[PDB]
Design a protein around this ligand. Structure first.
Ligand SMILES: [Cl-]
Ligand SMILES: [Cl-]
Ligand SMILES: [Cl-]
Ligand SMILES: [Cl-]
Ligand SMILES: [Cl-]
Ligand SMILES: [Cl-]
Ligand SMILES: [Cl-]
Ligand SMILES: [Cl-]
Ligand SMILES: [Co+2]
Ligand SMILES: [Co+2]
Ligand SMILES: [Co+2]
Ligand SMILES: [Co+2]
Lengths: 433, 433, 433, 433
């Protein structure tokens, strides 16, 4: 039997040490009384869409922040990241004739797993930065001592963000007639800004053709579906935002539409797996180089006993050198046991380089290589490359080569997100041809 | 006051001399009791579409036979001519983002006007061939004496033809997924068969994009609208198929959706103008080089007193050398009097060459020249080039250079119809740009 | 192996004796060159709809003439019979929330099977009247000698009829906003004209609600689907109108969408079964009291080898006293052999009374009794009462008690057709509840 | 020239006195950097819908809290109030065939205007409670001293509320198939719970009929439009959430879709009118007994110079005894000057009784009387009764007879909201009949 708190009985990684247990309890509790970020019916809709992807009739586009922060909470940043998602989706949908399920790593992706539980600088040792939901980035005691009030600040930032995202998606910003205005200024001059300008003109032509045919009024051209997701890492936050569906009595984690378990917290006997095991959400698990096929099958027996094709997204993050060696054996076990999974590629988290400095780098070319290989590997085994899962930004920076080089990892910029979409689009077209 | 027979009181051109008045009366009368080819509501729908064209929001595609015959009455011929119309319409609709109203010169276009009321061959003089509805093409007394039973044979051929055309249009033949199968074999190798193959692939892409967006089920992609038209020349036939709309009590000529008056029978005080003056159909008038602006205005006062923009299609057939000289003055009068008309180009009937032999020729290049000039002239005067009106065939012949060289005029073949559509499509795109 | 003429090698019932074989051949042949009444894609659509009915997700409404005649060929009669079908369908569709497949016994139902191959009146013996497609109703040699020219007259009447029916169905007559105008004058005063007036007001309310919701423009409210059917009795006519689908190369009988075999011509080794065995149409077989379960299974092995749920409609005509005794054993065999069939009730042809006079009567109450029992019997066996199959008229007569009392059988009038629809509607609602 | 702060230069009512100007400035400013509650395109959509109502083609349903509080911030309360709105709208839309524009007094309606700037209890005098956005309800210094941090708490409650409302409206809660589940438990037994149960069954029938017709998939049956509104009273909050539309450069108050000015703050030369004068939102003005026709016209010259029919909602709150005397003269001036306005009835704020105690009462019967009279008055003058504007709750209380009896006014309960909707629905049906 499961309950929203049965995770507290399991061994657990990556949890911060709070100075005041009773204070923490009071905040968990204020938060239990706050409205949910999502409605359970919506999470069932995403499951429905997941089952399409899993059967080879759609593709999953998941993208957003490494880890959102309190210091960067603006409409502009939310809007520009959403623009990049719309761009990518429209490119894939059109070139490949393929529905694309849109999931933002947004409105709740605050917590960070870490290698080390603390950090040392010139003889001083303090608790590690675990994301703004837990503590602050600044190297000083007050910043680093976990503050449970941050749970609420993270909640508030999330309702503001999701509220605006919902409004963009339904209220006209995502209307296909706005296809041009989704290209960010940044993508000004490359051949790229121009490969998209043509695709966009085509879409204009498509829509002109439809009004000429008498289809100018379809709501499906004016709005789109948009879902949110984050790593369920801080189980305090998740529990508090876990609610029963009134219609079915079934528990959903209503902090977001989809939750996923990290590579460092996926212990079969651990708290994170216990938590997500009993919620009705569609969910994911990060699958890195350390996963063998036995563990994988056991993990699936726990997270998808009924072998439902809408339930479980396996997010493969191997590294461009390792994907070829490791993935196949994993696909083959799944095939052999007749399991229904959605396979996605996280081509970022297994390609980060951390130098003694503590400085992180990602070569964008490695990122493309892992993707290209993920598609190759699925081609060969007779299975479906279902999804992509990336960190990206609408901001005008270049973080990958080809706060985000230390505590966080480097995000794709808009140019890079687009080249990737074009690449994915061609491959998908070939798959379907 | 008007009635279905008030035309009989006017002077009249082009009517055959029947040997037995009472026999003719008996047939007119059997035919008055036969069901109508069209339903009055449909004719009102075409008016509606005509008013769109007239306001610059659609374009009229009218095409079919010179004059249908009893000897060529096959599903194959009807199907192939319809294919050519679908091709042309899809090209124009897509390249130009413009609804195209489809009217077939079909299911009733049997009667022929002639220069001369008789014909002489080696000292023998017989009544002229006026179409199979009246008499036969063969040079011999029995053939040439008007036979009123032919009124019925023409009716029967028309219900068979329209019935099949309706079935093609609504029952799946005109479904946009069939876009490739509308190219006739004939159009095998040119760059042309290939310019259309690409446009067709684009359309496939457009439709894939729409099912990816969730629009796979729209009835408007599965069926299309199709209307019929002929020259109301034989007023016996028209009268008999003229019926009252039960809903409104208003008279419609239900032999076809649209009727038109020829260049040789458009006398202001004549029978043809009297007939069409009192029916509710949308209608047309052939406007040739002999029309001045005064006569034109008077004609319009009679055929469209209420200045309704759905009522009246002016079908300009000037000749490629004369269109530039004559049309402008006509447009200007109309503009100056604030009349609502649909302007169309018949670029065929003013470009036929009849040599002493009696052999008729049309140079296709002249045909393109008159069209190109018709568009130019409208460009200059600030008015709308609304339509095209051609004779064409799906059969594998070449009759225009670039029975149909004697009694009839040479039709466009499929290749030629397509080049014309591409040309019209570019021009329309430019108009709208 | 099958061909359009392999029926000529089998023994055969109910065929007329023609005086001139070569004349007959010449007409079969003129007719082979005439366009088809329907397009093969349409017949595949009806199969599709049949498979819905068979699976319990729609209901079949088949209705029209006993046998059309040359003397009654008017738009008014076609229109009024169609009105009665629309009425019935709208009643069933709305009260029961059930799609209704509409099939007219129209545009080809000319031929009549007879008990006796001849008829005697005061010492004179002449060939029996077999419908106007074969010979005339008048008791005299010239009338009664089979005339193959009648094949063409029947064809011509059919294209005229179908052309008009297609126009009504698609061009606005069947638009749901016209729901009131479908009640015929006749149904003036009963409680009945009033039960329908209320249902119609409800429909108005439904449509107002939909335009208030923003659904005013759906093509599915403006037009409806309509199919034709007749007994394939005269195999000369059927063969000539049997054509290959260009797309698939498969033979379809294109005289009508659906064909059926009569109770007197369903010999397993006979010509009629041979003919329909090789066409792609959906088809039916009249199943009367003389059918046992063995014969039934054999018949199905022949007409639906692949056990396709769209293929075969079994039209049960038992008599109100016999339906209870005979039908169950037939259903049970089918169930036991896992066959897919569409079950329909013809509650007319097994309830006709023929007195020594030769005068035929049907008591309408018997008709309702057989239907009510057909539904009861399906209720009990766990199977689906799929359809109704009746003869009816929009004309203002009363032929059933509660030419059509001699050569033909008495048709339901409009009042009676409506009471039946209301009855069927309630029962269907109960089935689905 | 206007700017987001030009209101600060005008004289101003109802503003609280803050102890620390610089602290207040710091909070206004944190809030200026927070994302907006709504997107400007959405506000333009509401204008569009307002112009429909104004032209007599829709009706406005505005309903929600008197004044939201921090102590009642639960998903349950937001959900239940939304249920009551859906109920009311579905009743009106169906019975009357009339689109209903839905505006919630929600996600920002926190501030309260007051009669008196302070309050005295047993010799102690403190600043008056002005809503939780300003200060607390408790009678004590700390509560009553305006606290600018409350601006943020109100913002946070609003994004949480709107986010959930958006999710309900689009994500499946407002799907018309859920029509039954919108009736609150409360409305258990009356004839009323039953008048709605029948209307709901009808809707079920309507939808069954539409899937039978092939319309089961329309997005317009799955989701609905929902807008928010509040009195723009605290101009600090409004200014900070006033942003430029990126597309047009035009200023919108993005705290809500619609803003309105109270009866006590509508001074023509005042700050509130200055603020709303320069934003692009649709807006409203409370029109109470003190308004004459001169002032009204001047007010309209300021708030709708361009006389746009989407811009301005006049919310008439007269009292049931005064509506008859006062409204007509106001309508007549408007008619005479040819002004485009949306007329709505607030039948609550002019019917509150405040006894010496300070205890407020509303008799529900007075409320129905004012509405009924508002419709009568519009009937007589030839103008359109456009809207209703009420305070209501999904909670199981009875506050009107037939915190909310002191600081706030008594809200309609669910039973009462429904009786009102039924009443409005009948009247609207009669108007349209
Ligand atoms: Cl503490
Ligand atoms: Cl790290
Ligand atoms: Cl004669
Ligand atoms: Cl000539
Ligand atoms: Cl003979
Ligand atoms: Cl008989
Ligand atoms: Cl202070
Ligand atoms: Cl007060
Ligand atoms: Co990261
Ligand atoms: Co010609
Ligand atoms: Co019969
Ligand atoms: Co109030």
């Amino acid at each position: 039997s499961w309950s929203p708190e049965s995770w507290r009985a399991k061994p657990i990684q990556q949890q911060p040490e709070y100075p005041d247990a009773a204070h923490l309890a009071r905040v968990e509790q204020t938060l239990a009384g706050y409205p949910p970020l999502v409605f359970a019916g919506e999470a069932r809709e995403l499951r429905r869409q997941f089952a399409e992807v899993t059967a080879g009739r759609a593709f999953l586009l998941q993208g957003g922040d490494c880890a959102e922060s309190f210091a960067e909470f603006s409409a502009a940043k939310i809007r520009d990241t959403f623009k990049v998602l719309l761009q990518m989706a429209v490119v894939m949908t059109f070139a490949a004739g393929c529905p694309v399920v849109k999931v933002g790593r947004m409105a709740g992706q605050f917590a960070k797993p870490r290698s080390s539980g603390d950090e040392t600088q010139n003889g001083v040792t303090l608790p590690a930065y675990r994301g703004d939901i837990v503590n602050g980035i600044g190297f000083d005691e007050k910043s680093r001592v976990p503050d449970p009030e941050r749970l609420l600040q993270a909640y508030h930032q999330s309702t503001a963000s999701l509220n605006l995202l919902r409004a963009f998606a339904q209220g006209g910003f995502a209307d296909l007639h706005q296809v041009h205005r989704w290209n960010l200024d940044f993508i000004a001059n490359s051949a790229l800004a121009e490969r998209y300008q043509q695709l966009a003109d085509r879409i204009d032509e498509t829509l002109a053709f439809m009004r000429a045919c008498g289809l100018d009024s379809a709501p499906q051209l004016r709005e789109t579906s948009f879902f949110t997701a984050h790593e369920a890492l801080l189980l305090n936050y998740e529990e508090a935002l876990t609610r029963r569906d009134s219609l079915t009595g079934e528990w959903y984690d209503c902090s977001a539409h989809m939750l996923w378990i990290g590579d460092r917290t996926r212990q079969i006997d651990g708290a994170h797996v216990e938590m997500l095991r009993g919620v009705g959400n569609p969910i994911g698990v990060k699958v890195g180089p350390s996963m063998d096929s036995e563990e994988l099958i056991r993990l699936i027996d726990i997270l998808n006993p009924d072998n439902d094709p809408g339930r479980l997204n396996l997010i493969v993050r191997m590294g461009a050198d390792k994907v070829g060696d490791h993935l196949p054996r994993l696909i083959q076990a799944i095939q052999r046991e007749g399991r229904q999974v959605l396979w996605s590629s996280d081509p970022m988290h297994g390609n980060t380089i951390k130098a003694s400095s503590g400085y992180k780098t990602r070569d964008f070319a490695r990122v493309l290589a892992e993707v290209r290989q993920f598609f190759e590997v699925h081609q060969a085994e007779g299975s479906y490359a279902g999804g992509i899962h990336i960190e990206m930004t609408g901001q005008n920076v270049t973080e990958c080569i080809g706060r985000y080089h230390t505590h966080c990892d480097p995000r794709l910029n808009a140019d890079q997100s687009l080249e990737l979409a074009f690449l994915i689009a061609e491959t998908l077209k070939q798959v379907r041809r």
